[PDB]
Amino acid sequence: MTEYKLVVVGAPGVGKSALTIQLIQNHFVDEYDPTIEDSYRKQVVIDGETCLLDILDTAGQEEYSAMRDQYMRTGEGFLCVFAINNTKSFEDIHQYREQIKRVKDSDDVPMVLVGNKCDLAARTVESRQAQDLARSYGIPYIETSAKTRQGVEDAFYTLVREIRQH
Amino acid sequence: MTEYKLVVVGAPGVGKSALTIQLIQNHFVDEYDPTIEDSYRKQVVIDGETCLLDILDTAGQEEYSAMRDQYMRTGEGFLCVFAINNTKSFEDIHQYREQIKRVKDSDDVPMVLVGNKCDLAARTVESRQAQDLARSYGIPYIETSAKTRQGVEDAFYTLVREIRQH
Numbered sequence: 298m299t300e301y302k303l304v305v306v307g308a309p310g311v312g313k314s315a316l317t318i319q320l321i322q323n324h325f326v327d328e329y330d331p332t333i334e335d336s337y338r339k340q341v342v343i344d345g346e347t348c349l350l351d352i353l354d355t356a357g358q359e360e361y362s363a364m365r366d367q368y369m370r371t372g373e374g375f376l377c378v379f380a381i382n383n384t385k386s387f388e389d390i391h392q393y394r395e396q397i398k399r400v401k402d403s404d405d406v407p408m409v410l411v412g413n414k415c416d417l418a419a420r421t422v423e424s425r426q427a428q429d430l431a432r433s434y435g436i437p438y439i440e441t442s443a444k445t446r447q448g449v450e451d452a453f454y455t456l457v458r459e460i461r462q463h
Numbered sequence: 464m465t466e467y468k469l470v471v472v473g474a475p476g477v478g479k480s481a482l483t484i485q486l487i488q489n490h491f492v493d494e495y496d497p498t499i500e501d502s503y504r505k506q507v508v509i510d511g512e513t514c515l516l517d518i519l520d521t522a523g524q525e526e527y528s529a530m531r532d533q534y535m536r537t538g539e540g541f542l543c544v545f546a547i548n549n550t551k552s553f554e555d556i557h558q559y560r561e562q563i564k565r566v567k568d569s570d571d572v573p574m575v576l577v578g579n580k581c582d583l584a585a586r587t588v589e590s591r592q593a594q595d596l597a598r599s600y601g602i603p604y605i606e607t608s609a610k611t612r613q614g615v616e617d618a619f620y621t622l623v624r625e626i627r628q629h
């Protein structure tokens with residue numbers, strides 16, 4: 298069956314894991330638990346096609362650097378996550394995307410920009426800001442909340458659809 | 464506020480109305496009730512942007528012909544609907560798209576191909592078939608069921624996102 302190798306990347310603490318666990322295990326992880334590296338494989342049906350989602354959940358931190366090249370080389374699509382209440386994480390998105398482009402030698406790699414934690418009332422990143430950045434990248438922008446489950450399937454299924462028509 | 468003028472088109476009986484009513488009124492219309500023309504306006508928030516969805520629900524039938532040019536000229540995005548248990552409706556998709564392209568003098572108009580009634584076990588149109596047609600058009604393919612609500616928000620929000628980066 299078609300397998301889609303999805304990679305979730307973004308700054309420490311933005312909700313990479315919480316989004317992934319919501320998708321795979323249907324619950325909000327409300328606890329501090331930093332990732333080193335985790336993978337999740339799940340059989341799903343998306344728009345009638347039977348497929349397997351092979352998801353790598355990554356660490357946002359330092360050492361990784363070249364350990365990042367490795368998973369960026371084999372990933373087919375990337376969810377680029379920032380948190381709407383954390384401006385530095387939104388600014389960090391550019392470094393992740395430049396790094397993906399260099400390793401893939403490509404200026405169009407399937408990618409979705411995700412503004413997570415939209416359930417929080419204190420936003421520091423306006424939707425408009427994120428929206429212009431995504432359009433400058435030519436990629437979709439989706440806001441999500443791993444807490445309410447808002448936009449979670451939408452964010453991952455839109456990425457599969459981006460891979461499908463690459 | 465940003466308004467998005469969405470138009471739902473497709474053959475008689477494929478579920479144009481049922482999809483629209485699911486979105487706006489949250490209930491499945493399980494009755495025979497042919498459309499002449501209906502419009503629905505609703506304020507929503509999509510990916511953090513406050514906007515108004517102005518939706519025209521159209522008739523699939525004959526007279527319309529030039530009455531179609533009229534609403535195709537002002538529509539910004541089109542949901543092109545067929546039913547997965549009705550092959551003629553899938554074949555009719557091509558005439559609707561050619562007609563949209565001619566009136567808009569454009570080969571890329573925001574559009575989503577929707578295979579509705581995916582809750583039914585007797586499909587006559589394979590997902591694979593629909594998927595290759597959408598990719599040949601360069602547009603997303605989404606399967607939906609107005610009965611279960613599966614994919615309904617996804618189909619309309621993906622169309623808004625297509626308009627946003629046109």
Ligand SMILES: Nc1nc2c(ncn2[C@@H]2O[C@H](COP(=O)(O)OP(=O)(O)NP(=O)(O)O)[C@@H](O)[C@H]2O)c(=O)[nH]1
Binds near residue numbers: 313356413443
């Ligand atoms: N309100 C709210 N909290 C969230 C959301 N997503 C994650 N969180 C919280 O934010 C914190 C970090 O979440 P986590 O998923 O571990 O982030 P991460 O990006 O995976 N961290 P790491 O890079 O270390 O691997 C946790 O306390 C988690 O519960 C969200 O959508 N809304």
Ligand SMILES: Nc1nc2c(ncn2[C@@H]2O[C@H](COP(=O)(O)OP(=O)(O)NP(=O)(O)O)[C@@H](O)[C@H]2O)c(=O)[nH]1
Binds near residue numbers: 480
């Ligand atoms: N099982 C199932 N039935 C559906 C679905 N969508 C619509 N129907 C049924 O199919 C029939 C036609 O639905 P309707 O929404 O009126 O189709 P239409 O495309 O709007 N017809 P018209 O072109 O005449 O305006 C109705 O009996 C309706 O309940 C669906 O997703 N699943």
Ligand SMILES: [Mg+2]
Binds near residue numbers: 313354
């Ligand atoms: Mg994590």
Ligand SMILES: [Mg+2]
Binds near residue numbers: 479498520522
């Ligand atoms: Mg109707």
